[PDB]
Design a protein around this nucleic acid. Structure first.
Lengths: 142, 58, 94, 117, 146, 127, 101
RNA sequence: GUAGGGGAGCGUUCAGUCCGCGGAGAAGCCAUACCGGAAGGAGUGGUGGAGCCGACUGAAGUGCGGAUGCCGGCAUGAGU
RNA sequence: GCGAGAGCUAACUUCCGUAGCCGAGAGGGAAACAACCCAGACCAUCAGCUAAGGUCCCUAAAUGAUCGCUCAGUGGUUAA
RNA sequence: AAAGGUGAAAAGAACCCCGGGAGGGGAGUGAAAGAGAACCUGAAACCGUGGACUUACAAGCAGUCAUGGCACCUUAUGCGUGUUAUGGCGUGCCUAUUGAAGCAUGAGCCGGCGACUUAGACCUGACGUGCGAGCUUAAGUUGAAAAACGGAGGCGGAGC
């Protein structure tokens, strides 16, 4: 008896990451992606709008962006394949700092993965707006 | 004894997953220029015995 | 819902647990919670104003459903039939 | 006198085999395993009714506030509110009214706020 | 028929067997099988008395019947035995029992479904209750005892 | 209609473009490899492919084909020059268990399998 | 010729206590009779025995089995019965048949 | 709700009895979204080619996944 | 867990007393997890209130309110 | 050791096609012939052909509940049947245990076979029936397409 599905929708929002606390922001992104105020609001499949983040490179942390925030990454058979970098150390690819803090606050299943697909970050600003030809409702954080 | 041995019967499935490569390749028969019967390119036509002329007896 | 419907609608045949009053046409009368008679979005009590009337359509024996249980190691296996009874009624109230 | 088990066992089985369908390999073609698959099956069958009840109600709530927050409230708040108005008592369906009838939901929403602060 | 020792108590590779003549062996013995016996018990006398007595009733309570000699017969014939049967209500639709001595009389009863003969009141709760109509006939066993 | 009993009489039931070699002393598994290339094509081709294919499963698979044909014509009055291989497939006949010595007393049993190669020809055509 | 299983020979019922069904060790799926170890396929742990008080208990008494007299109670004669005669025989049918003693 | 106790039933074969059934087609087999609280039962269709349902009662070599069980068939290992 | 012997006031150590639980206990919690915490499963239901626990996102529910504490990532492995 | 079964009856398949043969396809006999002599029924594991829906960023006790797509609808178009996708939950069975998914035991899969019985005038007890302050036969006897006879003997009846 409960409601069914739709589709012909793909709200194309553009959140700004500037100065905002990565995490907070993240949660937000992770929100809409999966399902915000949701349409049919349903599991089975995703209807959670498409997210575009600009800047990123200017996200924000606090006491540690040198200390503590160490994005680890362990490659091949761990024959000492213990590779880690300070977050500030992610000045080579801020892009991932976000992108790779959100794919966390998102289901980890089959669908879950297919959901990073809709998240789409850009380390810049206006130039980013180029990889942007559809809608662009700028729903900043709070 | 028979030292190494299998840890289970393999699915009739998996046992097939394998075999997806034993499929023969059908010869590339070609039509003789004379007997017009099909021959194997580069060899003598088993039917007429030709190869531009007739080599093998009838 | 928890027996004896409610809400708006347009008058359909729906299945809800037995209604005692057998036979048919037993003009059934239900309170009302919410409803929009003419879009008139009406909420509780202020809704009590209006009401619903339905007519017992038919009584039914639901679709069979075997209730099974099983706890392992301790043997224990329970197969038991079942199927609930219901009363279909035709909506048609104010 | 001799009393076989003829035709009595075949039946017994096919009864089970047959319960098995979209049961992958052996779990559907061979008795023994077929049947065995069907104990855990019990475990699930049962504990699943008592359960889908929890689940669904979870889909209901999730919407009831992804609509509530759609005006400025939140299930939490939006709900104690209707509760405030003993007048309101749907809970069941309420969500649907959130999913299809935006007009209404609006009403109830604000209806609560004015039974709140 | 079977020998007595088999393989190797151990280290043969899965087994542990005695003969090839045992319950769990296609071809062997039948644990708890059936052997000859008698299942014949002596049911107390007084009941074997309240037997046919009680049965006789039932019959009387319904389709009873007697006979005091059957000059009606004459010869084996059977043919005429059927005759009498007729005008005696013995249409030929009922199982009929004719307890009666009279060696010559019985002699006429080689016809099916109808009757089944039965000598010197050597009755039997079965037969009687078995067949439909009872031709107690001979008042012999029927009147006078002890 | 009528009732089974009747039908069985009114009809004789035939197999169009059918032929089967029963009990071919060969593993079904081997033979399928061959039959597998011939399935579905110009019966002309089937003829042609076989003569060349290297597998010894070939001769038989032949003899059955030039009969699923010889019937397609004679007994069925078909039009051979449009006769394609409708269907072919191989099934396993008996199995010739045979016992074979081995290392230190133990023994083994060889399976000399067999096959039923049935092949079915049909008149092609497009419409 | 409608339908009629008929009452009579076949219509004869048992009694409702006359005789209950045997017992085959399988009460539901879940039967594996006996204790659960130290008891099975044999018969000898017994129930009697000679150490379990049987012994340790003193006694030699002494068995004899002298005479055993037939008790013809007083009420047996008085109260009822009109001297249907004692004597040495008539007592039999009076019922006080013991014999041997 | 485990050992264990108590209760009521389902099914197989044989047997006596009742009603019967069958070559325009029995048993067995195969299919199926019906019925019954379960054991289970029914309807319809296919195969089959002759014996067979239901009901009461009696007797049972009477119900199975396990025993490195038993016999037999057929797999995996592997065109190795 | 509480009360003791033992043992290094060592061990998922050992032996008693005592209460609870698992054994014979599913359900929610404790990431996961016999017995810890909440609570004892007659069946059916897209209905409702609660316990222990919880309410940034992965999950259901205030990134709640007010007065404070610490910049350590303490929180998210001990002591003189 | 194992190993049965054409049909009612041989009428057992003349003659023709492919093949060295085996094997098959027609024709014909027959009620029937995938009833044809590797001959009643012919399950299941196991092998295969064709078709329907699916499957080549995926971590899976192999199901289960929910929803959607697709197909079909003889107990069945209004509920379903089959199938599939995505989501949630989800540590095979048995045994032996304090404690099992358990890296603990057993087991390749199917079918058939496979385990609490039978006896003794035996003991004790629950239900029931026949008599009842009394209640019964045993061996045997004679009849039996049936069962009566047969009191020897046994149990109550006084205990210490």
């Amino acid at each position: 008896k409960t409601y069914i599905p739709k589709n012909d929708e793909q709200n194309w929002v553009v959140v700004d990451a500037s100065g905002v606390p990565l995490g907070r922001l993240a949660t937000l992104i992770a929100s809409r992606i999966r399902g915000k105020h949701r349409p049919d609001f349903t599991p089975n499949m995703i209807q959670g709008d498409f997210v575009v983040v600009i800047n990123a490179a200017q996200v924000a942390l606090t006491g540690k962006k040198l200390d503590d925030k160490v994005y680890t990454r362990y490659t091949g058979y761990q024959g000492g394949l213990k590779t880690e970098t300070a977050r500030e150390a992610l000045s080579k690819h801020p892009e991932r700092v976000i992108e790779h803090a959100v794919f966390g606050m998102l289901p980890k299943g089959r669908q879950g993965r297919a959901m990073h697909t809709r998240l789409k970050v850009y380390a810049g600003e206006t130039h980013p707006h180029s990889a942007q030809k559809p809608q662009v409702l700028k729903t900043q954080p709070l | 004894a028979k030292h190494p041995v299998p840890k289970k019967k393999t699915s009739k499935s998996k046992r097939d997953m394998r075999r997806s490569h034993h499929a023969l390749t059908a010869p590339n028969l070609t039509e003789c220029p004379q007997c017009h019967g099909k021959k194997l390119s580069h060899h003598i036509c088993p039917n007429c015995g030709y190869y531009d002329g007739r080599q093998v007896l009838a | 819902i928890q027996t004896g419907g409610k809400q708006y609608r347009v008058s359909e045949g729906d299945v809800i647990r037995v209604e005692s009053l057998q036979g048919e046409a037993g003009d059934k009368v239900e309170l009302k919670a919410l409803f929009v008679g003419g879009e008139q979005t009406v909420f509780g009590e202020d809704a009590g104003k209006y009401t619903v009337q339905a007519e017992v359509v038919e009584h039914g024996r639901g679709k069979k459903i075997y209730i099974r249980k099983y706890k392992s190691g301790v043997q224990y296996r329970r197969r038991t039939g079942h199927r609930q009874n219901f009363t279909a009624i035709k909506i048609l109230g104010i | 006198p001799r009393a076989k088990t003829g035709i009595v066992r075949r039946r017994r089985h096919k009864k089970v085999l047959k319960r098995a369908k979209g049961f992958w390999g052996s779990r559907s073609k061979q008795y023994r395993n077929a049947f065995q698959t069907l104990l855990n099956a019990a475990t699930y069958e049962y504990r699943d009714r008592r359960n889908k009840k929890r689940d669904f109600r979870r889909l209901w709530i999730q919407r009831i506030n992804a609509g509530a927050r759609l005006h400025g409230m939140n299930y939490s708040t939006f709900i104690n509110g209707l509760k405030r108005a003993n007048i309101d008592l749907n809970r069941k369906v309420l969500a649907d009214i959130a999913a299809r009838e935006p007009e209404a939901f609006k009403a109830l929403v604000d209806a609560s706020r004015n039974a709140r602060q | 028929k079977t020998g007595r020792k088999m393989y190797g108590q151990k280290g043969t590779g899965n087994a542990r067997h005695g003969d090839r003549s045992v319950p769990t062996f296609v071809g062997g013995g039948v644990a708890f099988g059936p052997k000859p016996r008698s299942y014949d018990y002596t049911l107390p006398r007084q009941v074997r008395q309240l037997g046919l007595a009680m049965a006789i009733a039932s019959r009387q309570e319904g389709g009873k019947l007697v006979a005091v000699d059957g000059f009606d017969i004459a010869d084996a014939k059977t043919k005429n035995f059927i005759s009498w049967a007729k005008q005696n209500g013995l249409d030929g639709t009922e199982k009929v029992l004719l307890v009666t001595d009279d060696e010559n009389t019985r002699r006429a009863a080689r016809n099916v479904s109808w009757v089944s003969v039965l000598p010197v009141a050597g009755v039997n709760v079965y037969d009687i209750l078995r067949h439909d109509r009872l031709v107690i006939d001979a008042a012999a066993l029927e009147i006078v005892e002890e | 209609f009528r009732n089974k009993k009747q039908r069985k009489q009114q009809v004789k039931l035939r197999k169009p473009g059918f032929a089967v070699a029963k009990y071919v002393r060969m593993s079904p598994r081997k033979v399928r490899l061959v039959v597998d290339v011939i399935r579905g094509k110009s019966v002309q081709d089937a003829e042609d492919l076989l003569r060349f294919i290297p597998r010894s499963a070939s001769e038989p698979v032949a003899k059955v084909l030039n009969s699923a044909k010889a019937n397609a014509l004679h007994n069925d009055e078909m039009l051979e020059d449009r006769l394609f291989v409708k269907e072919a497939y191989v099934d396993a006949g008996p199995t010739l268990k045979r016992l074979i010595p081995r290392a230190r007393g133990s023994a083994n049993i060889i399976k000399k399998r067999t096959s039923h190669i049935t092949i079915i020809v049909a008149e092609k055509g497009n419409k | 010729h409608d339908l009629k299983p008929t009452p009579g020979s076949r219509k004869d019922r048992k009694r409702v206590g006359r005789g209950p069904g045997g017992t085959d060790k399988t009460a539901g799926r879940g039967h594996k009779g006996q204790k659960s170890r130290s008891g099975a396929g044999k018969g000898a742990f017994f129930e009697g025995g000679r150490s379990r008080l049987i012994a340790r208990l003193p006694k030699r008494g002494f068995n004899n089995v002298g005479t055993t007299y037939e008790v013809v109670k007083l009420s047996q004669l008085q109260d009822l019965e009109d001297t249907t005669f004692d004597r040495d025989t008539l007592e039999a049918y009076r019922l006080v048949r013991r014999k041997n003693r």
